[PDB]
Structure formats: structure tokens, C-alpha cells
Amino acid sequence: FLDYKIIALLHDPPNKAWVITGRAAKYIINQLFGKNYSEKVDNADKLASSIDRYLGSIVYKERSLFENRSIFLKNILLSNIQRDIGNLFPKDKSKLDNLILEYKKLLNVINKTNLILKYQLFYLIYELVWIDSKYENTPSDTRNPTHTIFDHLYATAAMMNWILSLEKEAKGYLLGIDTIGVADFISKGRKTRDLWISSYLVSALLWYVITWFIEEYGPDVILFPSLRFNQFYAFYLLEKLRKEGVSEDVIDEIKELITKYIFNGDDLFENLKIPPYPIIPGRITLILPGLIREGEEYKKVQDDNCFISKVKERYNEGWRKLIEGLRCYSERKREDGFWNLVCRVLKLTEDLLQTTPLNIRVKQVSVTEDEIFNNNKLRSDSWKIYDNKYRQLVSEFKKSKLVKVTPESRLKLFELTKFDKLPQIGEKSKRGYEFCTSCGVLPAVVIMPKEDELEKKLIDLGIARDEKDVRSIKNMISPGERLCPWCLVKRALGAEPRLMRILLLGDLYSVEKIVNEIVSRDVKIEIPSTSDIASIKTFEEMIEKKNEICEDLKEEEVCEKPSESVLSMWQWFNKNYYNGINLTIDPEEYWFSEKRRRYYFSVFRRHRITFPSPYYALVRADSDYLGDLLEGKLTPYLAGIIDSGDYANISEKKEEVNKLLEEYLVNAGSGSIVDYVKTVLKCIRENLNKCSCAEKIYSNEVAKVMFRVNVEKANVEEEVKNSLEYFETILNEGRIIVTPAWHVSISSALNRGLLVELELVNKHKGFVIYAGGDDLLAMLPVDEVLDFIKESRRAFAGFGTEKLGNMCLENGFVRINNAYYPSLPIVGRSYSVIIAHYADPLFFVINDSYNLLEEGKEIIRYRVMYNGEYKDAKKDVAIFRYQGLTSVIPLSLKRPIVSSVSDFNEIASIIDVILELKKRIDEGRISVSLLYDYEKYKHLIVASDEKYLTEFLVKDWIKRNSLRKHVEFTIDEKLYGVRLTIENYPIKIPNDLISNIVYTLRIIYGGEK
């Protein structure tokens, strides 16, 4: 039997530090059977993390051998930023049952014949109502406060699946999914409608496939991304219960409990009826047992193929559901316009659409009883497989990555193209067929007349069945466009995204139920085109002064009433829709239009208001060396000093890698156990190399035994040998040991970051396209880029000049109002920013942003400060490009990034410099020539290495183009000798920082012409 993981999950409550050695299972259960432990949850506690093998082999199972009244709280990555859990504790012992009544506030509305709900509905709200008790986020083991309590309570439930797979007789699998070409698929689009919905396509298509998983096995079978703050799992579970059928009062226990934490906005999954942000990673792993759910029980079959194909069929089944739902919708709607077209084509082509425009890989490694056990216990090298099997998985991945199968290579076109067997709508192409202007790699089936009589020209072609539908046609499809089947699907799905619900639920409803629920509710959804975001201030200059500077525009339906219902996923559309101005205009029709332009140019001048700027800003981010950190390497700790390739024979870096883990591992302890390690560590080359160094000093463990003695034997010639072999296999090879706890903690930390940068983006007039665990994509006005980065980088490391939605962004952690949650400061993060004309093809902008940061991360070294001396790092850059004016701003100038608790202002300091400079250039303190005269001082500055000569040269260049004579804005000295070591590439980058400070402002002040 499975799904009883509540006791596998709650093998001990978050009251752990409140039952351990004072400061007050003590409570087992009141609404379930007794939790069994012969070796059942024993393994769940011992194999889930290293804390039971890092500190000895029995201390964690005793929870009293090195105790202490004060309980630290350490970061999992850099155990130096501290937190203290103090006295405040889960609500009083005398009322400890009330919270259980608060447990039972919504677990008693639906039948308790099945656990596939009664176990997982609480999963997501477990962490929620608990922080309403404000429990202050205790750690799991107080002798090692590196893993918070809830994280371990989930990590144990993770490998509980493998426990049960050994409880049948033996099985267990690590399956990994990953869609193949994402950055390619996203490239196809024309108005950012297609962009955001192709992102949402990747996301929802991968969300469809693991719904089945969480219904056959329940969550916590998934490792990445953590199903903790999933904006998709939230909506999914929520609508599951809504279809289960309960008064909005009955769900109101969960609705606000979400909206206050997740979905911190107003327009949410109940106003768009869709999650306004795609957050699923295009690749996800799974720890899968050998059981099979087909009814009433869980049977097993010994094969591995029972998943490799049963996941592919589900992935394609989701696409089939979507395409047939679009068939039903376009049928139910031909009487509008532009839907006649979608029906007509889905009938003119059906078989090309029988294969999804994405692909996936799937690898799935095994596990057995052999060498995981002998009879009933764990042997030497038994904690040493999970990360082994994990590496096996990622090795299969990166081996198969050598080949690339683009989706189209699946299509059966040969006959359809050799002869006129391909259907064309519009002009039967003179040359046999055309390529769609969006993919450029497929034959298009809709070919708009370019422009001569666009009104008649297509009414001259029977595509326009009558004089009416031409508006709904000419709206969603620009003249001259050419659409393949796959891109007409996306143009349609951009006409409305609500049909993606068919993909969300993993076939929970029927398809007709979904589409006919959404043909009743009828509401207009809008998506910000590049022309919109390139006019943000242009509306603000017309929002503060509504009609004060609008009198002639009072008739052009821009200064007029927002009419029906229009609502967007764009948060800045939820906070200015009712400002009187309709953000539903098409700015390419009034002033970003050609004929109606010069009029407006003489119009705005008398109201003394600017011409708008034809530039948005495609920001994207990336976490440098994320894979090595999940694998468990130190390239994230030393981004630039060591590369992946310097891990083939890691024995050369035995200076760096052997440091920087000690100071973490040896410090990750506290109290007295720290000394337990603070001596035992170096005694390998420092000592007789074998298990007799610690035997001398082991005694300060046995120096606490007899107060309530429980232990069976004190003859530790093994727990000194085992705590030596542990560190020997990990310093002899200077990697880390990876745990389920490691992974789940990092994925959760990625989800908190997801929330916080989702708030960051729309804090500015941003527009998310894809907020991911370690990545991002957005469009911002060219005025809010730097200040954004400057925080989003900092915020990623965990640092707040502000409360974001309701999350406290402290130093090193992200504390949810009592829950100090660890952030990822040690993880690097690069940025890539493109200042793009609104009339630029998105295909190219996306490609040359992705590749820009794609090779920019892997090409540019800069002079950094490691161990106090000077090294050359390779990642954590912030690249810009106007159109041929590339610029690069580093972001750390230290390695590791923040090795001290107050290093949190080293990060992105350069952009503070650029802000203090740009702020004063335009205030009339410093002339415009500051950026035209550097081409006279640059040579001396880069030829200098006596930093006070350089300081005086900079001071002179600042002073000689000052409008006053009395401004004294100085650059820090440390920004003088750094050098941007780019090598052998036709891209042009200045080889000294201040030139890049100059070029960044060149770009940005140029993004306003």
C-alpha cells in the first residue's frame, strides 16, 4: 500500500526542535493509523539526506548527543549566513490540538475512500496554514541547521516511493523529461502573442504529462520543479476541487490562502481563468517506483519500457486533445470571423497536425535491492547511489544532447510537396509553395495578399466569404504574412488562450466540457504587442494629464472609454485599464502609423510632450553553472576559476576545491559537533591517512553520554571510520554528495525566486514572457532596465531594499513573514538585454538574445578577486546590445560571489555606478559630451595601471565636461584595473570596464530616438 506518506511525510512534525532537548514522536497522529517503523520510515529518514551520514551514523537517530539550547539556521549552500530560531515556537502545547483542528478545517468535505486527494490537497496547504501559525521555520536537524524542516519532510516522502518499490520486492527508477528545442520554438512568432503563447505551449504541454503522474502516484514523486509554489499545480488542484464541487465558501479556505502568497496580483486564475505566467521548466525529472496504478491497487512489472513509451504517448495525447478542442471551438464559432479560417484549415490539413511541434527526450535509470541492501540494513557505499543514479540520468541526457531532432523532421511532407498535394489558401503560389514568414522552415497554407486591395484582394479570393469577416481576418493576421499549420494554430491560440485549459487538467474533464464551459463565459483577453510596451511612458504622460493635454485626441477613441471587459495577464494592464485611457488601442494605428504621424508630431509639441520611443527591451536572465550545482559541483562556487572541463581529473584543483568546501562543511555544524568535524576533517594528508586520526579526538562525542542513556554500544571504531570514509570519497574527489533534500531545497528556492521576480518585473512596467526557476524573459521600457537588473540580480541572491508582494527579502534568505527561506546568492546569474525596435522581427531578436547570452556566458572572462588575489572569472555578466553596440557589465568582482554575510553590496555595484551617472547626465550637472570625450581619455586610462593616475584621469574627464564646476561624482577605485578578457570572436567588446560603463549608457540613451 502507498499514499500513506502522511506519516512518511510527517515522520516528525515541524515541532522537531521543540521536542529535542528542551526549549518547550511526541505526537504521532489523531486522524490516521499508527506510523510503523521497523525499517519502513527508518530508511525514509536515513537515506533522505546526508545529515544522518555527515554527522556520524547514530547522532541524528538519537537527537541528543551534541545538543544546545540555541538553534542556528544555515543556508544549504554557504553555511555562514545565520538565522536563530529562538523561543517563539508552534502554537502552545495546551492548544497543540487546535492547529490539528485547523488541519481538519477542509479535509472533511469529500469522500475518504481515496487517498489520491486526501494526501495531496494538504501537501500544498501544509506549508501555507503552518506559516499562518508563523512557526518561524525551524531546521530539520539542530546539530546541522542546513536543511529546513518542511524541506526534509518532503524529501523523505520523495524517496519513500523507492522505499515502497523495495517493499514490493525491488524496483525504482529515475525518469527525466526534457523538451528538445525550446529557444527555437519560442523564436517563431510575430507580435509577442505568438511568443508568450509558445512559451505557454511548452509550459502547458509539459504540465499535461505529469498530471497523470501525480494522479497515479501523488506529488512528491516529482523532484523538479518542486510542487511547492507552482502557479500551475495551484490552479490545477484548485479546479480539481472546484469540479469535485464545493461552495465558493468551502474553497475560500484555500482561495485567499493562495492569493496572498502565490498570485500576489488582482487579476488571477479566476479572472483570466488561466495562470497569467508560464512557469513550468521545459525539462523535469522524476523518481519513479515500479508500481502501476490501474485500479484498487498498485501492481508492478520488472521492465523499464513501462515508462519510456508511456510518457511519449501522453505527451502527444495532450497535443491531440488540444488540436481537437480547437477543432470544436472553431466549429462552434465560425459565425464570428477568422474562425471560419481556422475551421477551414483544420479541415484542409489534419494529418500534419497529428504530430506536435515539439519533441521530448526521456531517459530512465533503474535501482534494485542489490548493493542498496544486504538483508535488512544499509552497507558501506549504500548512501552512495542516489547521486550516482542521478549522474547516470544526466549523463544519458548530455550524451543524447549531441544530436538534435527538430520537430519538423517528423512531418510526412514528401508526397505533399513533390506534387501539388499540399492545400494552399489564397494565392496558389507561382513557385510551387511558400515558406511561412514565422517559421521559415515549413510550407505555409495561408498566404495573405500582401497589399493592393486588401479589402477586395482577399474578398477576390474566397478566403473572405463575405464583406464582414475581413475585419476579424485582417486583425489577427497582418497583410503579407504566411502561416504554416503549426503557426496558424498559434495565431488562433493567440486570438484567445482560454483553450489551453484542455492542456492544464491532464484530461480531468472531458474536452467538450471544457470548451463548452468556455463558450458560455465570454470575455476579451489582450496581449501587449511590442508597439504597446514601446509606449508605456507615452500613456503615462497621457494618464497623469488625461485630457489636460488631450483635447483633439478626445475623438480618436484613445482618449475615450474602455468599453467592454478587456483584461490582460499584463499586470500593468490590470493597474491602468480603468485609468480612462483604453490600453486596447493599436499604437501602430495612430502614431506608430505612418500617415497619421506628422499630425501627431505637431500635436504633441504644443502640449510640450515627447515623441514616443520606438524601442522595447527584451530582458532575459540565466543561472550560470546551475547544472553543476544540482549535480553537486563547485563551479557555481567558483564561476570562472574552474570550468566543467576541469572536472575530468579534479585532482589538479586540490587547492581551490579542497578549500571552499571545508569552510562550508566544517562550518556547517555548530555548538560542539562543529569541533567534532573541525578536527576530523584535515586528518587525511595532515594525518596517518586512515581511521586513527579521529579515534584520539573522538572522545568528545562520548563526553555527553550518561544523563538519560539510550545508546546500545559505545565501541565506535566504525562511526570514526565511516565519518572518515564519507569525507574521503568527497575530498579525495572534491565534489559534494547530493541528496533528495539538496534537490528539493534548490527547486523550492527556485520557486520562491519565481514569485519574487514575478513581482519585480511588473513592479516596473514589465511583461513576463517566461518566468522560470533559474531563467526569465520579459519586455520593459528602455527606462526601467538597469534599475530592474540591479535589484533582480540582488533579489536573486536574496537581498531586499523593499517588500515585494509580501515576502521579506533579507540578507541571504527570503523570509515569508516568519519563514526564513534560503535564497541562492552563491548561484550566479547572467543577463542579456536587447534594445529592439518595435518593427523588428521577433524571430531575430529572440535568437540574438539567446545566443548573445548563450555564447557571451561561455566566451567572456574578466579580472576577478579570488582569495584576495586576482583571477579571471568567466560568468555572471550582464550583456547589452543596441544594434551593433555591445556592452558588458560584470556583476560580482569576487569569487565566491558573496563569501561574507555583508558582501551583499558587492553585487551589481557597477549598475549603481551607471545609475548615479545617468541620473546626473540629464539633470544638467554633466554635459552630453561625457560619452563623446571618453574616446580621448580611454587610451591613457587603459594604458595606466597606477590607479591614482587613473583616478585623476577619470576625475579630469568628469570635470572637463561639467555644466557646473562643483559636481564631484567619483568612481570607486576597484573599478579601474579590471579587464574584459574576450577572445577570438568577431564580436566587438572594449577590453576595459569604464568603456563598457560608457557604452551601456550609449545604448540606453540611444534607446530613445
Binding site: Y882, Q883, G884, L885, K988, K1009
Partner: protein, 285 residues
């Protein structure tokens, strides 16, 4: 064969010259010339063909049929063209000079480098096997020059030393032979090492700041300021007009090309740029 004959020719800039390329902001001009792949100026074959097509259609308004045959149609883009230009290769840019105890005192010289000559020899060698194009003195001289690669060479055995474009001091040495004047100007030709030749040539190009002025109060308008490169006068580009076998091609080459001395190339014709003299390499050298 389907390229029966080829007529090489030089292109002497009579006025300054601006054949423009994609305006941008990275190279700090606003409007550069057309770089080839090594940064040297070059006239794309499309620009050559289009400009010469327009000139000929204006001049000979009857042979419009023959011109539309050889160079192609525009209302019937069905039948291809019987003739093609190769991208005009920069041959010799004119440079200022200051003599240093040298016999004949010059104030300007022609300057080449060794990539430019490698490309010129590529063209010539490639078209040589047509039985109509011999001019073996030309590629003879080009080859004896290329033999001496790696040294600032002068085709006039008296300079021995110079300062080019008031910035670059080059110490010369003669080709150990007379190698008669390739280009019939009474001016010495200098073939330079590549690294220094690129400097000298980039500094031989004209770069102009231009402005737009309000006619009322004679003050510059906002945003009305840019810059652009011209190729100087006296500059020589090299190209070839490749033709196929037909008899419109023959009548073209027999009377269109006998009378084609001056042509208007590139942009900014109102400013005077773009006049060019085409020298057919079948009589000279």
C-alpha cells in the same frame, strides 16, 4: 561553358565616390562605404550592374531591348541575364606622401596592399582561360609583385623612403626590375605590407561631418548631424564583365561598351559624388 568571354576593367573615381551600405551606429560614421570582408572599400556587383543599367537605359534609349537582354529585365523577371559583374575590387587608393631624400618629388602616390593584389590576381587568373583574354603582361606584373610579398615595395625605383598620409613612415625598396607602369598615371605605385597598408588606406578615406540648417534663422536643426565616408578621387577599383555566348551580348559588347567611358555610381549625385571613368583592360596594359 556558359560564360564565353570576360572583359576586365578599371574604375577611376573622377569625383569622390559614395557607394553606401547599411547605415547603423557601431563604426561611428553614420553612413559608411561598402567594406568587402577585409575592411577595404568595394562596389558590390549589384550596385555596379544597377547603376550601369540605369546609365545605359538613359543614354541609348533604343537599344533598350539589347540592354534588357544582356543585363536583364524588370517587367519580365523570367529569362535570366547574359552578363554579370564581379564585385569591384579595390586596386589602388591614392595617398599623400612626403618624400625623404628621394629623386623625383611627389606629393601623392597610389597605394596597394598584398590582399588587394591577391584578389586581383584571383580575378585575372580565373578569367584567363577564355582564349580571348590574354593581357599576360598584367598578370605577369601582378605575379612578380606578389613574389616580393612581405615588404613595402615601390614600383618607382627612386623613393626609398616616405611618409604616407602624414602619419605612417614606410621604408621602401624597389622591385629589382622596372615592371612598367600598370596604371598609366605618371604616379608611383606602392604595394605595402598588409598591417600597415590597412592603416594607410583607412586614413586615405574621406570622412565628412554634415549638417542640416534651418533656412530661416541659419541654425542647425535637432538631430540634423551625421557623417559619411567617401572614397577619394583617383581611386581605382577592378572588376570584370562576364558575358555568355548570345548575339545580343555581341552587339552589346560591340557598341554599348565601345562608347562607355563615364558612368554615375553610388549615391549622393546631387553632391557631385559618383562620377567614374571605366577603363577597359584590352587597350591599356
Amino acid at each position: 561553358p556558359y560564360y564565353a568571354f570576360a572583359e576586365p576593367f578599371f574604375i577611376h573615381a573622377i569625383t569622390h565616390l559614395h557607394v553606401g551600405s547599411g547605415s547603423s551606429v557601431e563604426e561611428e560614421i553614420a553612413l559608411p562605404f561598402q567594406r568587402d570582408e577585409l575592411g577595404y572599400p568595394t562596389i558590390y556587383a549589384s550596385s555596379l550592374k544597377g547603376a550601369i543599367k540605369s546609365f545605359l537605359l538613359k543614354e541609348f534609349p533604343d537599344k533598350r531591348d539589347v540592354i534588357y537582354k544582356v543585363l536583364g529585365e524588370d517587367e519580365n523577371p523570367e529569362e535570366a541575364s547574359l552578363g554579370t559583374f564581379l564585385d569591384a575590387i579595390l586596386f589602388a587608393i591614392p595617398s599623400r606622401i612626403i618624400e625623404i631624400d628621394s629623386a623625383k618629388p611627389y606629393v601623392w602616390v597610389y597605394v596597394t596592399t598584398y590582399e588587394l593584389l591577391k584578389k586581383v590576381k584571383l580575378y585575372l587568373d580565373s578569367i584567363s582561360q577564355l582564349s580571348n583574354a590574354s593581357f599576360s603582361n598584367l598578370k605577369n606584373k601582378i605575379d612578380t609583385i606578389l613574389a616580393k610579398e612581405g615588404k613595402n615595395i615601390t614600383l618607382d625605383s627612386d623613393l626609398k623612403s616616405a611618409i604616407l598620409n602624414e602619419d605612417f613612415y614606410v621604408e621602401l625598396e624597389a622591385l629589382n626590375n622596372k615592371i612598367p607602369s600598370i596604371i598609366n598615371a605618371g604616379v608611383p605605385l606602392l604595394v605595402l605590407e598588409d598591417s600597415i597598408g590597412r592603416e594607410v588606406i583607412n586614413r586615405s578615406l574621406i570622412r565628412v561631418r554634415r549638417i542640416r540648417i534651418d533656412r530661416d534663422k541659419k541654425v542647425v536643426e535637432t538631430g540634423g548631424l551625421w557623417s559619411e565616408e567617401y572614397v577619394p578621387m583617383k581611386t581605382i577599383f577592378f572588376s570584370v564583365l562576364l558575358g555568355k555566348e548570345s548575339k545580343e551580348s555581341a552587339i552589346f559588347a560591340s557598341c554599348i561598351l565601345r562608347n562607355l567611358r563615364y558612368v554615375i555610381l553610388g549615391g549622393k549625385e546631387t553632391i557631385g559624388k559618383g562620377i567614374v571613368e571605366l577603363r577597359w583592360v584590352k587597350d591599356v596594359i
